[PDB]
Write an enzyme that holds these catalytic residues in place. Sequence first.
Site, PDB file in Angstrom:
ATOM      1  N   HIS A  58      18.616  41.601  51.207  1.00  0.00           N
ATOM      2  CA  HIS A  58      19.696  42.425  51.736  1.00  0.00           C
ATOM      3  C   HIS A  58      20.658  42.919  50.640  1.00  0.00           C
ATOM      4  O   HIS A  58      21.574  43.675  50.955  1.00  0.00           O
ATOM      5  CB  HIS A  58      20.429  41.798  52.922  1.00  0.00           C
ATOM      6  N   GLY A  97      29.991  37.578  49.375  1.00  0.00           N
ATOM      7  CA  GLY A  97      29.712  37.504  47.945  1.00  0.00           C
ATOM      8  C   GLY A  97      28.944  36.243  47.578  1.00  0.00           C
ATOM      9  O   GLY A  97      28.380  36.171  46.485  1.00  0.00           O
ATOM     10  N   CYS A 130      26.182  35.113  49.048  1.00  0.00           N
ATOM     11  CA  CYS A 130      24.753  35.211  49.264  1.00  0.00           C
ATOM     12  C   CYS A 130      23.971  35.051  47.984  1.00  0.00           C
ATOM     13  O   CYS A 130      24.439  35.465  46.939  1.00  0.00           O
ATOM     14  CB  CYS A 130      24.392  36.495  49.989  1.00  0.00           C
TER      15      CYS A 130
HETATM   16  C1  LIG Z   1      25.956  40.428  57.816  1.00  0.00           C
HETATM   17  C2  LIG Z   1      27.394  39.994  57.564  1.00  0.00           C
HETATM   18  C3  LIG Z   1      27.894  39.111  58.702  1.00  0.00           C
HETATM   19  C4  LIG Z   1      28.294  41.212  57.409  1.00  0.00           C
HETATM   20  N1  LIG Z   1      27.443  39.217  56.306  1.00  0.00           N
HETATM   21  C5  LIG Z   1      26.774  38.083  56.061  1.00  0.00           C
HETATM   22  O1  LIG Z   1      26.153  37.452  56.907  1.00  0.00           O
HETATM   23  C6  LIG Z   1      26.894  37.569  54.616  1.00  0.00           C
HETATM   24  N2  LIG Z   1      27.392  38.516  53.586  1.00  0.00           N
HETATM   25  C7  LIG Z   1      26.642  39.668  53.177  1.00  0.00           C
HETATM   26  C8  LIG Z   1      27.150  40.529  52.212  1.00  0.00           C
HETATM   27  C9  LIG Z   1      26.475  41.696  51.893  1.00  0.00           C
HETATM   28  C10 LIG Z   1      25.294  42.041  52.539  1.00  0.00           C
HETATM   29  C11 LIG Z   1      24.630  43.378  52.286  1.00  0.00           C
HETATM   30  C12 LIG Z   1      25.444  44.495  52.965  1.00  0.00           C
HETATM   31  C13 LIG Z   1      26.448  45.084  52.075  1.00  0.00           C
HETATM   32  N3  LIG Z   1      27.203  45.539  51.349  1.00  0.00           N
HETATM   33  C14 LIG Z   1      24.779  41.159  53.478  1.00  0.00           C
HETATM   34  C15 LIG Z   1      25.432  39.980  53.789  1.00  0.00           C
HETATM   35  C16 LIG Z   1      27.799  36.354  54.533  1.00  0.00           C
HETATM   36  C17 LIG Z   1      29.162  36.467  54.743  1.00  0.00           C
HETATM   37  C18 LIG Z   1      29.965  35.346  54.701  1.00  0.00           C
HETATM   38  C19 LIG Z   1      29.370  34.130  54.457  1.00  0.00           C
HETATM   39  N4  LIG Z   1      28.059  33.980  54.272  1.00  0.00           N
HETATM   40  C20 LIG Z   1      27.306  35.081  54.303  1.00  0.00           C
END
Ligand SMILES: CC(C)(C)NC(=O)[C@@H](Nc1ccc(CCC#N)cc1)c1cccnc1
Lengths: 304, 304
Positions: free
Chosen positions: A41, A143, A145
């Site tokens: 992702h 951040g 991930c």
């Molecule tokens: C899908 C959501 C809920 C928004 N984020 C996540 O599930 C995770 N963050 C995430 C960051 C960027 C991207 C790509 C999209 C762009 N730029 C994908 C995911 C996350 C957040 C907080 C804690 N753990 C994991």
Amino acid sequence: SGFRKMAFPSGKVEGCMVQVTCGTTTLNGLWLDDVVYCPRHVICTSEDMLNPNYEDLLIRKSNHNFLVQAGNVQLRVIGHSMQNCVLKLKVDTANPKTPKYKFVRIQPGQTFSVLACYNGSPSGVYQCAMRPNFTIKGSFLNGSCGSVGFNIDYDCVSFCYMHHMELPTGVHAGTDLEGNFYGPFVDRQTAQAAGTDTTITVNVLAWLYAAVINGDRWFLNRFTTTLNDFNLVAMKYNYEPLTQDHVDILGPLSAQTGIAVLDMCASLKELLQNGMNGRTILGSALLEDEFTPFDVVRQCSGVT
Amino acid sequence: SGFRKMAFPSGKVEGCMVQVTCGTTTLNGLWLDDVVYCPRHVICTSEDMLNPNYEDLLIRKSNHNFLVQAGNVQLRVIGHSMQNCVLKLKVDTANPKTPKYKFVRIQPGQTFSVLACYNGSPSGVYQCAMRPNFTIKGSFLNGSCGSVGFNIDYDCVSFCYMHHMELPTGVHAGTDLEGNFYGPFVDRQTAQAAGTDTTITVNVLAWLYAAVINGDRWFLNRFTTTLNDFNLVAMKYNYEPLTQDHVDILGPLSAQTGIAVLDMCASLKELLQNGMNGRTILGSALLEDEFTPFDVVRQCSGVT
Ligand SMILES: CC(C)(C)NC(=O)[C@@H](Nc1ccc(CCC#N)cc1)c1cccnc1
Ligand SMILES: CC(C)(C)NC(=O)[C@@H](Nc1ccc(CCC#N)cc1)c1cccnc1
């Protein structure tokens, strides 16, 4: 003496953390030999996350679109491929700090350390367990991930987890290092509810043994039970069923303390039925389930 | 989201751990530049510990009696000196892995990470707090002496603790890196009882703010209190008095959540008076006091 929620020393894993940027998305990568592993992702925008077609989104990305930075030095990307939900970025330089390592897929109830990272930089280390519903209760912000979970056997790091997602309930989901999610979770911003977060019974029993070894003995009672009787109580309290395999795994702790496994089960049964009555066990007011029998043995014997 | 008892990444400290042997006693040392720091009781036999005269025991030791091993390589000892309760062994080689560092003496209520070691080898890392009675509740076995406590500010390791002793009650005592014990403890196997282990009020309040930031809000009530009224309740419950300095330190968390510090004090007062009623806060059934306001800010903002 004393018993703490202890993580593995993180140095060997800190030496592997890199920052990966693709377009406007920056997360962490794990650099082992000449390959950087990261969540696929990283190729998504926030909008793409609602309904991503990863194969299609990846066609628009070339090697030069993946920016990999180890410390303050840029790594050259000479290949990229998608394996399940992770990208493998082949770089032209083997990580000089690559430890001896394995990729392992853990079972629910197993514990591991997480090195939480932001921008390829380590922020902290903590101990987790893969919950029976295949989520982990971590501490991850946007951040984080690409941060990884691992165990260490002397000089070998067994990587078991890579962080990908936060469910709308604030619990976490991710993959093994082959990119396969734990549980039914998918890397898409959609409705994903977790199942019952049951208690890992064999870990609670291990922790009660750690409590007896460290002097907290008030909960030991005059009773015994059977696996079937204990399991009727375990079911009522959303505890995982205890199997003969779990009893065998607790054998060494039973031998060291002289407390038969089924006697400890009877003590646990009374704690479930009666509660703690305002008392604590190893400084906790609840029954801790994120120490495996191996963790208790390791901590109580001083394995390095 | 999620909130965990997180330790600092330990790599910078792992690079400093060495094994120190003197006669039949082996413990850990901290190698920074060309000096190895270790507890002076490395010169004692088990019998000497009952009533040691360290200056006298040290006269019988020469540089060649201190065996220092970093990994599987022996370091050459070219000088030794006693500073308070630590020995400083001057070696002929500066540690190539010496991080930027400081020696700090912390205050009660301050938290730090411990890298538990055996035979100069790291076994695990966990988060501690200097208790108000100057003990720490660690996880240390025989051989762990010389393991250190530290905090990290970006690239600077501030060493604050070196492990020396386990009190007969299973709690731990040690020194700063100048060899001065925290509290009244001495490096002798004698009757040393710890004072009241009060709860670090400012840390509990910080953790209640972390709970609100992470969604656990059930304990927020309709009340407020004053510092004097709150402190009458804090005294009754063996909590440290809250000062205006603590209120000022909680300012940023108050600003971020919109919950005035005294309103959070009133929520804490009701939790003390009423208990949790079987509920949990951040997965804990007791009020956690081993997160400082700085730890909560650091963890909730993703500082690396
Ligand atoms: C899908 C959501 C809920 C928004 N984020 C996540 O599930 C995770 N963050 C995430 C960051 C960027 C991207 C790509 C999209 C762009 N730029 C994908 C995911 C996350 C957040 C907080 C804690 N753990 C994991
Ligand atoms: C004084 C006692 C209680 C016996 N040990 C300690 O207080 C500590 N161990 C220790 C080992 C050797 C020496 C030198 C004497 C020889 N050889 C001195 C101290 C200890 C143990 C367990 C956990 N933490 C710290």
